Design a protein around this ligand. Structure first.
Ligand SMILES: Nc1ncnc2c1ncn2[C@@H]1O[C@H](COP(=O)(O)OP(=O)(O)O)[C@@H](O)[C@H]1O
Length: 328
C-alpha cells in the first residue's frame, strides 16, 4: 500500500473516509499526493485531498501544515484574506489526508497556457497583487511565514478571478527563525536569507515581488544557479548591498571579503567587485496603450519598493495595498 519513499500510489474509483470518491489525479508528488475527489456525504461536491507522504519527517510537516491552516482559517472567518481553505482531516492506510477546497490550477500552469514569455494582462496582475498582499496581511496578523511564495504555490479558481495561497508544508513561526541559507525556493529567496541576517515577514514580501514580475513578463526575475549568483542578480538592479546590512549577517565571508567587496563565482574562478552598478532596466524588461503603459510604470514603482535589498527599507503590506497600482 505504501512505497519505499513513502507514497500511497492511489487508485481511481477508491473511496476515502467512506465518503471521498477519487476520480482525478492532479499530480504526485512531490512530497504528497494531491487527488481530485467527490464527497458523497455532501451531494458529490468537488474536493481536493492531499495525501501526506509516510516516513518520519514528512508526517511532522503534515501536522505542522494542518495546525497553520487551521490558525489562518479561524483568523479569517469570512474568507477575504485569500488563503487556502482546509475543510477537515482524516487518516487513510497510515497517511495523513488533508481535505481542501477545489481549485482549478496553479499560476505556473496558467502562465504556460498564456505562452512563452507572454505573461498575464495588467488588469489581472493588478487584481492578483491585491489578493497576494491580502494573503500577506493575514500571514502577518498571525505569526506565520509561508517561506515558499511562488507561482507553483498560488492556486486559482475555474474563472481565474480569485487566487489562494497554498502549500504550507515549509511554513514556520516568526519566533523560531532557523539559521539556514536554503530557506525559500532559490529564485524567490530574499537577500537576508542568503547573507544570514535576521528575517521576518519581509521574505514573503520579497517573494511576492519576484512573482509579480513573473506574472506580467512570463519570465523568472532572478534565475540564479547558486546563492552567490542570486546576490549578483539582486545587486544588478539595486546596486551594491549596504555595509550595515552585510555586517548583520552570518554567511558574510561566503560572498563578501574583509573590505566588504562582493566575490562573484564563475575551474572555481573568483572575481572581486568593489562597486556594482545598476545595469538591469526594470521598465524595459516589463514593457502598448497609454492606459496600460501608465499601470506598468505604477507596477515598476511598486516593484522598486518591494525589491529593496534591506528588509527594514522594504514596503509594508498596508502601503502596498494603498499603492497607486492597486488603487488605480
Ligand atoms: N486545494 C486544491 N485544489 C486543487 N488543486 C490543488 C489544491 N491544492 C493543491 N493542489 C494541486 O496540487 C499541487 C501540489 O500541491 P502541494 O500543496 O504543493 O503538495 P506538496 O507540498 O507535497 O508539493 C498544486 O500545485 C495544485 O496543482
Amino acid at each position: 500500500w505504501t512505497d519505499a519513499e513513502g507514497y500511497y500510489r492511489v487508485n481511481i474509483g477508491e473511496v476515502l473516509d467512506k465518503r471521498y470518491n477519487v476520480y482525478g489525479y492532479t499530480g504526485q508528488g512531490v512530497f504528497s499526493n494531491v487527488v481530485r475527489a467527490r464527497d458523497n456525504a455532501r451531494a458529490n461536491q468537488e474536493v481536493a485531498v492531499k495525501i501526506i507522504r509516510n516516513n518520519e519527517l514528512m508526517q511532522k510537516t503534515g501536522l505542522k501544515e494542518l495546525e497553520f491552516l487551521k490558525k489562518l482559517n479561524d483568523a479569517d472567518p469570512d474568507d477575504k484574506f485569500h488563503c487556502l481553505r482546509l475543510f477537515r482531516h482524516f487518516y487513510h492506510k497510515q497517511h495523513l489526508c488533508l481535505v481542501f477546497e477545489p481549485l482549478s490550477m496553479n499560476l505556473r500552469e496558467v502562465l504556460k497556457k498564456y505562452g512563452k514569455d507572454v505573461g498575464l494582462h495588467i488588469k489581472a496582475v493588478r487584481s492578483y497583487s491585491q489578493q497576494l498582499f491580502l494573503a500577506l496581511k493575514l500571514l502577518k496578523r498571525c505569526n506565520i511565514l509561508h517561506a515558499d511564495i511562488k507561482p507553483d504555490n498560488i492556486l486559482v479558481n475555474e474563472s481565474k478571478t480569485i487566487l489562494k495561497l497554498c502549500d504550507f508544508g515549509s511554513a514556520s513561526h516568526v519566533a523560531d527563525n532557523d539559521i539556514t541559507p536554503y530557506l525559500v525556493s532559490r529564485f524567490y529567496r530574499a537577500p537576508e536569507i542568503i547573507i544570514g541576517k535576521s528575517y521576518d515577514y519581509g521574505i514573503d514580501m520579497w517573494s511576492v515581488g519576484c512573482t509579480l514580475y513573473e506574472l506580467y513578463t512570463g519570465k523568472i526575475l532572478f534565475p540564479g544557479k547558486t546563492n552567490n549568483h542570486m546576490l549578483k542578480l539582486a545587486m544588478d538592479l539595486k546596486g551594491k548591498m549596504p555595509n550595515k546590512m552585510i555586517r548583520k549577517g552570518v554567511f558574510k565571508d561566503q560572498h563578501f571579503d574583509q573590505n566588504l567587496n562582493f566575490m562573484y563565482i564563475e575551474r572555481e574562478k573568483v572575481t572581486v567587485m568593489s562597486t556594482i552598478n545598476p545595469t538591469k532596466d526594470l521598465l524595459a524588461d516589463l514593457i502598448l496603450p497609454e492606459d496600460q503603459r501608465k499601470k506598468v510604470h505604477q507596477l515598476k514603482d511598486l516593484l522598486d519598493q518591494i525589491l529593496m535589498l534591506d528588509p527594514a527599507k522594504r514596503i509594508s503590506i498596508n502601503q502596498a495595498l494603498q499603492h497607486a497600482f492597486i488603487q488605480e
